Design a protein around this nucleic acid. Structure first.
Ligand SMILES: [Mg+2]
Ligand SMILES: [Mg+2]
Ligand SMILES: [Mg+2]
Ligand SMILES: [Mg+2]
Ligand SMILES: [Mg+2]
Ligand SMILES: [Mg+2]
Ligand SMILES: [Mg+2]
Ligand SMILES: [Mg+2]
Ligand SMILES: [Mg+2]
Ligand SMILES: [Mg+2]
Ligand SMILES: [Mg+2]
Ligand SMILES: [Mg+2]
Ligand SMILES: [Mg+2]
Ligand SMILES: [Mg+2]
Ligand SMILES: [Mg+2]
Ligand SMILES: [Mg+2]
Ligand SMILES: [Mg+2]
Ligand SMILES: [Mg+2]
Ligand SMILES: [Mg+2]
Ligand SMILES: [Mg+2]
Ligand SMILES: [Mg+2]
Ligand SMILES: [Mg+2]
Ligand SMILES: [Mg+2]
Ligand SMILES: [Mg+2]
Ligand SMILES: [Mg+2]
Ligand SMILES: [Mg+2]
Ligand SMILES: [Mg+2]
Ligand SMILES: [Mg+2]
Ligand SMILES: [Mg+2]
Ligand SMILES: [Mg+2]
Ligand SMILES: [Mg+2]
Ligand SMILES: [Mg+2]
Ligand SMILES: [Mg+2]
Ligand SMILES: [Mg+2]
Ligand SMILES: [Mg+2]
Ligand SMILES: [Mg+2]
Ligand SMILES: [Mg+2]
Ligand SMILES: [Mg+2]
Ligand SMILES: [Mg+2]
Ligand SMILES: [Mg+2]
Ligand SMILES: [Mg+2]
Ligand SMILES: [Mg+2]
Ligand SMILES: [Mg+2]
Ligand SMILES: [Mg+2]
Ligand SMILES: [Mg+2]
Ligand SMILES: [Mg+2]
Ligand SMILES: [Mg+2]
Ligand SMILES: [Mg+2]
Ligand SMILES: [Mg+2]
Ligand SMILES: [Mg+2]
Ligand SMILES: [Mg+2]
Lengths: 141, 83, 184, 98, 59, 70
RNA sequence: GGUGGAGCCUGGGAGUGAGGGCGCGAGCGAUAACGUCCGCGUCCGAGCGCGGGAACAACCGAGACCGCCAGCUAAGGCCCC
RNA sequence: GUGCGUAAUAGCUCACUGGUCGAGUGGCGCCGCGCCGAAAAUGAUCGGGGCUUAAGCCCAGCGCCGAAGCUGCGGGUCUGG
RNA sequence: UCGCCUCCUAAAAGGUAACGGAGGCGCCCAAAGGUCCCCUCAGGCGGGACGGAAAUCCGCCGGAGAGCGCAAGGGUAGAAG
RNA sequence: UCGAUCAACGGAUAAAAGUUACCCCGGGGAUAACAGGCUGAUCUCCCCCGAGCGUCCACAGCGGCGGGGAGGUUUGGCACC
RNA sequence: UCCCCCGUGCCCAUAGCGGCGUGGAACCACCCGUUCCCAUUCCGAACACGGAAGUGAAACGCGCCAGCGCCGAUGGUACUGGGCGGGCGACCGCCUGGGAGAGUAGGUCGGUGCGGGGG
């Protein structure tokens, strides 16, 4: 799928989502990027679906950069079970995304293909997106 | 319907220990007053300060606690007498 | 290029930035002043320009100064700048990542492949009078897999960089083959 | 680094520090918590005999004398890498016993 | 010395204990009650703490 | 290969009221479930437990069987 | 600084040891529950007395000794009811 | 080679140029307020009537109304003086 | 599941719940204890008959990643080793 | 100074397991089974995206991976009358 | 006062690493020996004693260089005591105090008590 090979701990506390991405806000790799506008937990099955959606779109073409990674475990109790008796079992992993985060990047692809590409990938994401270019996104120094 | 469940082998924890500094800089103390409770040597005994088996720090004379941070050498708790 | 600049008295940061003026500070190894330089021209210029080409800064003193931007902090949520750092110059030798053009066609573009110009704006140590432009590199030799890098390039006389030279400047990698699927 | 610094074992006051040299042997009664030297007595740097050990003793009593003059009765014995032996200033005076 | 004249204008019902004590320290009991006090730092600290419930006048 | 992924795309799952004993709930809960296979005509039922969700999956755990055999 | 139904010490008499909602900080839960567990705070509990909110323990306004066919305000309102 | 069209062609057409007309133009991009998406079970409704340069929404201003809150006047009781 | 120890949850004092997350204890040491005196690791890279990819040698480099009886944490070579 | 898995570890006796649809009393909506309620994971329905199927040809009929909702008939959660 | 060297302390990396030079008259080291005091799980390497031909090679001292390391603003943000707003939620905004962590300019191959020996 797209989980981590090993982890010191298998289940971990839920947490929260205070706006601002902290990091990952500029392009820095490809030419066009997809930036998250709402905060959320993106399941690896979505990251995946979106990715495949792009390669599928411009089959045999440019390069894709997945800027996020699902390292946070998702717990879910069984069905018809009551509360308590311990924490649920891990059902998958998710990457936490905050507003401003550049989730994906593309390169070696026409500006038409780039747009269309990311527009399809955002239709697989639980949130709202924005497509970007490159310019001040040059924190080289 | 009540569909059976399991449990966890977790659930333990040990009593709180109340470790930490007990007297702060500029505070008057008497001989014996424990000034700090710590596990390692988070603080080093200074001028007129003793250290028990469990690293506890106590005043050796009757004075006013003072703190001194000595970079790579560590942090010290001294007890300045009314001298 | 050119651009108007004004003096900031140090009053209502977050406000002077809402009214339309963009905050900032100009410094160097001597003095350093606080100023405000509107988005209008700033934007327009800064994008064409960047942090490669120098700019003028005529204040109410006229005092036009030569500078390159060192720091430009965005706004995270919804791209926008909140600040800019100006490094004044002279004949004083300093650094700056110099633009990169890559005239050529890698052998990595016939049976699948695209150029990943890794460090497409290389940093070099040199003085004002020594400020080039499109510092091109050759790509006519980049095979599909294996790819160029380091400072193994055409550094015009005076180009005393600061790389390794190993710092992978660029590389050519394969496409996105529909052929995938898996599991197990 | 022959570190040692066993002298850090200085809980009390008045350190009688010795310094063995291939040629001479110096010694000064220092008082920290003030970072000052109160009494000093060098080997051939105060001019003395030609032996090494014999010289130790003489430069020993010497210091102790000058010491007591100032009321310097008791102290503590130093010389970090010392290795308490040979050049032993087993001098009279000084209320540092040893 | 230039004094202060604070007036309790908004009801403290619903605010933290400390804020209700600050008012005590100042000497404000009822709503609309005014009190001229010294301008010392210790007297302001409390009037700063309850700004949202007090209308202050420098007199 | 060895595969048979009968997607719940041609199944008709019902949930009648329990039969037999029970109590104030055997009359009230839709425990009993019935999964139906239409391109074959096979039907599997289940009232072994006292939950519909533990019965529709345990009733499917059979249709998978009989099918792999037929 | 601060004379307050403030404090400290000794002793007589207690009730309480089913809490609840709300705000903020976490866990559990499915970033479900008028859910459940703690933490800081508040209010109902005991303020089902009063004004606002259509009506409504806890949201906004406000701590009701009593009297008046007097005046100014709060939240909320000022087309008619 | 844009779309239609062919079994593959043909056939219609356009990016494109001449062209009479003799002027504003196509774009994209933020913003304020709206439109759709929008199906449940006794009679409907924003509390009702009824509201459209408003009786709606955003931004300025002044004046009123409005509690058992605060004043005014009288009275009771309790503490301190 | 029930007592004890360590970490987290715990909101930078202390404390703080849930059939919340994750591990240990019901021993051991006459040397693994007292004191005096010396000594300083793990690794990395070279060079070395047997010789792993660390047996034991040599050499540069190596501020602590070793070690500290056993879980974890704190501490520690200016030693607790 | 010794005898406790008094380990249900502040330790009822020195000494102790089941069954009741033959049952009984005192209590509780402090607490389950019905029904309601809050919730909507499950359930039912509808929608976004357009891989791909349909000779050709994304929607005549279909829709991979994924995304957003409605309802309150299912199974549950909660334990509010 | 001022220099150089030797002991010691305080600051506790702006003291370090690594380069490049210097210093033996004095200090110091290395050196010369292992009778003697004293020493090696084997070694006079280390400890220790007696020395005094030679060297400043090793070490150490003092200088210079910034490549590595370390230090590090001014601005602007994050977050946030307290007060207050918008939504239906996840969350978002204002006021008033406080205010980083990264990063940029830039800084640094030391500072300094006390006691000795030498001009
Ligand atoms: Mg960065
Ligand atoms: Mg020693
Ligand atoms: Mg209120
Ligand atoms: Mg039965
Ligand atoms: Mg039922
Ligand atoms: Mg009281
Ligand atoms: Mg009493
Ligand atoms: Mg009691
Ligand atoms: Mg209770
Ligand atoms: Mg309470
Ligand atoms: Mg409460
Ligand atoms: Mg709730
Ligand atoms: Mg509740
Ligand atoms: Mg009650
Ligand atoms: Mg109350
Ligand atoms: Mg009522
Ligand atoms: Mg009302
Ligand atoms: Mg009310
Ligand atoms: Mg009252
Ligand atoms: Mg009243
Ligand atoms: Mg009205
Ligand atoms: Mg008003
Ligand atoms: Mg819209
Ligand atoms: Mg009025
Ligand atoms: Mg009266
Ligand atoms: Mg009265
Ligand atoms: Mg704590
Ligand atoms: Mg805290
Ligand atoms: Mg001991
Ligand atoms: Mg021993
Ligand atoms: Mg090694
Ligand atoms: Mg008993
Ligand atoms: Mg018990
Ligand atoms: Mg018994
Ligand atoms: Mg029978
Ligand atoms: Mg009978
Ligand atoms: Mg019978
Ligand atoms: Mg009977
Ligand atoms: Mg009964
Ligand atoms: Mg009853
Ligand atoms: Mg109940
Ligand atoms: Mg029910
Ligand atoms: Mg009912
Ligand atoms: Mg799908
Ligand atoms: Mg229903
Ligand atoms: Mg239900
Ligand atoms: Mg409850
Ligand atoms: Mg030596
Ligand atoms: Mg905040
Ligand atoms: Mg700052
Ligand atoms: Mg900083």
């Amino acid at each position: 799928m797209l989980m981590p090979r090993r982890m010191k701990y298998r289940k971990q506390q839920r947490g929260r989502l205070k706006g601002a991405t902290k990091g990952g806000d500029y392009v820095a790799f490809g030419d066009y990027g997809l930036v998250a506008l709402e905060p959320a937990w993106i399941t690896a099955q979505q990251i995946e679906a979106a990715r495949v959606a792009m390669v599928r779109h411009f089959r045999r073409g440019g390069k894709i950069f997945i800027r996020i990674f699902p390292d946070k475990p998702y717990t879910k109790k069984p069905l018809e079970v009551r509360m308590g008796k311990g924490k649920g079992n891990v059902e998958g992993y998710v990457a936490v995304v905050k507003p401003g985060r550049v989730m994906f990047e593309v390169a070696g692809v026409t500006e038409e293909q780039a747009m269309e590409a990311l527009r399809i990938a955002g239709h697989k994401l639980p949130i709202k997106t924005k497509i970007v270019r490159r310019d001040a996104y040059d924190e080289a120094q | 319907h009540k569909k059976g469940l399991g449990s966890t082998r977790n659930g333990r924890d040990s009593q709180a220990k109340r470790l930490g500094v007990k007297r702060y800089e500029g505070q008057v103390v008497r001989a014996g007053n424990i000034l700090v409770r710590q596990r390692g040597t988070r603080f080093k005994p200074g001028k007129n300060v003793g250290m028990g088996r469990d690293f506890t720090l106590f005043a050796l004379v009757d004075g006013v606690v003072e703190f001194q941070d000595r970079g790579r050498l560590g942090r010290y708790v001294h007890v300045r007498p009314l001298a | 290029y050119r651009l108007k600049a004004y003096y900031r008295e140090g009053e209502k940061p977050s406000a002077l930035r809402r009214a339309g003026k963009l905050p900032g500070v100009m410094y160097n190894r001597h003095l350093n002043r606080k100023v405000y330089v509107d988005l209008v021209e700033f934007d327009k210029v800064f994008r064409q320009a960047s942090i490669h080409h120098v700019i003028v800064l005529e204040l109410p003193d006229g005092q036009s100064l030569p500078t390159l931007v060192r720091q430009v902090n965005l706004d995270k949520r919804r791209r926008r700048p909140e600040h800019v750092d100006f490094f004044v110059l002279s004949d004083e030798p300093v650094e700056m990542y110099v633009p990169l053009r890559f005239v050529g066609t890698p052998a990595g573009v016939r049976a699948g492949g695209v150029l990943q110009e890794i460090h497409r704006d290389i940093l070099v140590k040199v003085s004002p009078r020594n400020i080039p432009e499109f510092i091109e590199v050759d790509v006519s030799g980049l095979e599909i897999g294996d790819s160029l890098h380091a400072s193994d390039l055409k550094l015009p006389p005076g180009v005393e960089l600061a790389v390794s030279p190993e710092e992978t400047i660029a590389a050519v990698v394969p496409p996105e083959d529909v052929e995938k699927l898996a599991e197990e | 680094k022959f570190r040692v610094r066993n002298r850090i074992k200085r809980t009390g006051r008045l350190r009688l520090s010795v310094f063995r040299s291939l040629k001479h042997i110096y010694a000064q009664i220092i008082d920290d918590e003030k970072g000052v030297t109160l009494v000093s007595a060098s080997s051939l740097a105060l001019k003395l005999k030609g032996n090494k050990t014999e010289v130790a003793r003489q430069v020993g009593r010497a210091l102790a004398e000058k010491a007591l003059a100032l009321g310097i009765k008791q102290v503590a014995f130093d010389r970090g890498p010392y290795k308490y032996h040979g050049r032993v200033k087993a001098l009279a005076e000084g209320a540092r016993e040893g | 010395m230039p004094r202060l004249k604070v007036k309790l204008v908004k009801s403290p019902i619903g605010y933290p204990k400390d804020q209700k004590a600050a008012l005590k320290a100042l000497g404000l009991r009822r709503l609309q009650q005014e009190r001229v006090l010294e301008d010392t730092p210790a007297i302001r600290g409390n009037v700063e703490k309850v700004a949202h419930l007090v209308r202050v006048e420098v007199v | 290969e060895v595969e048979v992924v009968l997607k719940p795309e041609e199944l008709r799952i019902d949930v009648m009221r329990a039969s037999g004993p029970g109590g104030q709930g055997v009359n009230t809960t839709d425990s009993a479930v019935r999964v139906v296979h239409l391109p074959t005509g096979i039907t599997v039922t289940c009232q072994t437990t006292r939950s519909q969700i533990k019965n529709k999956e345990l009733a499917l755990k059979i249709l998978k069987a009989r099918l792999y055999e037929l």
